[PDB]
């Protein structure tokens, strides 16, 4: 049983790997948008924090 | 050299350029990266080097230099 | 779960080791008791 | 946490309107009494300009 749980760990590890690529690739674009938005839009107009 | 990875990735994760980061400064407050941003930075570092960093060790990267200290 | 599985593996190996020793002891005891049954029949 | 979460959005909307309002003026408000005294100064300027 515990060996099969180890193989579960491997499957979960590759799932984690997928999620991790998602996160880093997303930030790469967040960078650009928040660079351009600094033309006073983000101050309060686009950032409707409600 | 290999550090070009870190000093590149850091910028790509924080919006600053390669030379902007100073070894004396701290990510948490002197770079503008909040808790979420620093988590993203450390986790991107984890992804790049195909390795793992537990929570305890990961929390010891608040300073700029540490990003290479644990690497090399 | 990764660290828990490592620890569980270590403990599991320990129990397997002590059971191996008891298996050997059981074979030795079977030898002795075979002799004992022979002795009963001889008496 | 549930109480704070239910309360949050109202407070945030109120804060956005307040920031817009006080920034639209020259003076920065900090309390109910402060807003009232600013009302009075506004009335005085009305009755001089008129």
UniProtKB/Swiss-Prot annotation, chain B:
Keyword Cell wall biogenesis/degradation: no
Predominant localisation class: cytoplasm
Annotated GO biological process: fatty acid biosynthetic process; lipid A biosynthetic process; lipid biosynthetic process; response to xenobiotic stimulus
UniProt keywords, alphabetically: Cytoplasm, Fatty acid biosynthesis, Fatty acid metabolism, Lipid biosynthesis, Lipid metabolism, Phosphopantetheine, Phosphoprotein
InterPro entries registered for this protein in UniProt: ACP, ACP-like_sf, PP-bd_ACP, Ppantetheine_attach_site
Compartment(s): Cytoplasm
Coiled-coil intervals, chain numbering: none
GO MF annotation terms: acyl binding; acyl carrier activity; lipid binding; phosphopantetheine binding
Residues recorded with modification O-(pantetheine 4'-phosphoryl)serine: 35
Stretches assigned to the Carrier domain: 1-72
Family indicated by similarity: Belongs to the acyl carrier protein (ACP) family.
Name of the protein described by the UniProt record: Acyl carrier protein
Organism the protein comes from: Escherichia coli (strain K12)
